[PDB]
Symmetry: C3
Subunit: 204 residues, 3 copies
């Protein structure tokens, strides 16, 4: 009995190690799928702008929303007649975001540009906001660049966040781009000045 039982234990331990290993390779594929989903949501949303702070209106259909979109243009960047939209719609004191899906990505990029060169954008004198529309995960990665961004800003590096969630800044007469925080760590680990500045923020 002690023989049949010891052999039953050994087999089980071996099946356990097999399971842990299959688990690791399964984990790797799920992660790869999660990253691929984030990327495709980002890709498919590229033609999209989020309009934030625009007052709700009664029986507000697509024609009304385009008309409002044109009022925003006239008030902030007049020369930016009719711009091409695949779709536009809202997503209770606080008005819902409007998601504007352009026919051509170039139109989305030109309106973003004009908005970031203008600083304050307004509809009838009150501040509205224009931003990109991204997967939840990328949106979060941008937010988490927050602390590092502010440090770089404070210390004259001219930071930017761009698509998808890349931080960029100047380092040696040149714009450097960092796709994620690990690619930044591997860059600062070489520059001492930058390293002591970002050490805590990079959780290095």
């Amino acid at each position: 009995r002690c023989d049949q039982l010891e052999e039953r234990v050994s087999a089980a331990e071996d099946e356990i190690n097999e399971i842990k290993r299959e688990g690791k390779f399964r984990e790797k594929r799920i992660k790869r799928n999660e990253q691929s989903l984030q990327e495709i949501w980002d890709y498919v949303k590229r033609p999209n702008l989020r309009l934030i702070g625009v007052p709700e209106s009664d029986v507000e259909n697509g024609t009304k929303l385009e008309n409002t979109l044109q009022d925003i243009i006239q008030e902030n960047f007049p020369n930016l007649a009719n711009v091409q939209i695949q779709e536009i719609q809202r997503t209770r004191a606080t008005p819902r975001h409007i998601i504007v899906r352009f026919t051509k990505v170039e139109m989305k990029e030109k309106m973003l540009r004009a908005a970031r060169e203008k600083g304050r954008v307004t509809l009838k004198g009150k501040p509205i906001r224009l931003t990109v529309d991204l997967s939840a995960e990328t949106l979060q990665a941008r937010r988490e660049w927050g602390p590092i961004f502010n440090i770089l800003k404070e210390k004259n590096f001219q930071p930017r966040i761009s698509y998808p969630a890349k931080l960029s800044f100047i380092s040696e007469g040149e714009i450097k781009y960092f796709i994620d925080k690990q690619m930044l760590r591997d860059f600062v680990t070489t520059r001492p000045a930058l390293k002591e500045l970002l050490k805590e923020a990079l959780n290095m």
Copy 2:
């Protein structure tokens, strides 16, 4: 010493069960997110079902056929401005029509639903929303129930995987099986009268 090895094995087993449940939740999230992005990408599209196909076709022949369907079934819809198509192609195979504006896809779908019986040269065809296989299958699992609700303004939605929800009494309700829906409607005369035939009641 056996007892030691058994304890150790039981502990490793508990760790694997939890890891496994963690992975299962993420696999489910990924499945749901795939259903959503398929639905999202197909928003500008309609499926045109039952259209006779030819030995060889291209975009131009198919677009002239869409024009015939419009002229034959809802001409006024195209009176003031032409229907803007971005592209049209086969997957008699389904034809996928991709509109420039989602607004136009919606206008045409509505005219089809309000005409009832859409034909091409006298023969019945169908215009329908284009969706992920999952969402389509979910809507068929609910059958006519889903469409009666749509047609009476109840805002029905599929939620992953195949749950039905809609709004009644100013509250969103979710249903997993038809049985749950039956239980719910036995108390609502307005809603009961509408869905009885459809819930096999």
Copy 3:
């Protein structure tokens, strides 16, 4: 302790079974990701070897004028080191991508300011790999003047009996040669049959 080991074995068996069910859904998801990436990228063409500097759209028209006499709506054109990045041209109609690719494959050489560049498809990783894997079979069929072609997503087509036949994958082609002996003899080893 026998009860405890029997129970552990039951747990292990449940974990393995529940693991294969999970594994099949991971596979399902991987395949579904392949298909949605192919679908979304279907009107895309990739430009390789174009030097770095509306300008991109201008460059596209430049390439078109310089190379393809007969031959244009775009949804997006964008760049993806010393080597210039690829340019992804996202056409409005899949048909335009196809015509650009045909004209490139026919002209056999494509140039910008007289320097050779490459036009190619832009598809999921899995599908690009599937195309590359038709290589050995494509090469053989080309040699024997079967006029083979690889097209969307990863289908092989070629002339058999004056008629073009299409193969979604290698299994479909194996099934096809089970009843054509000379063709089977030709592709037997390439098909790992």
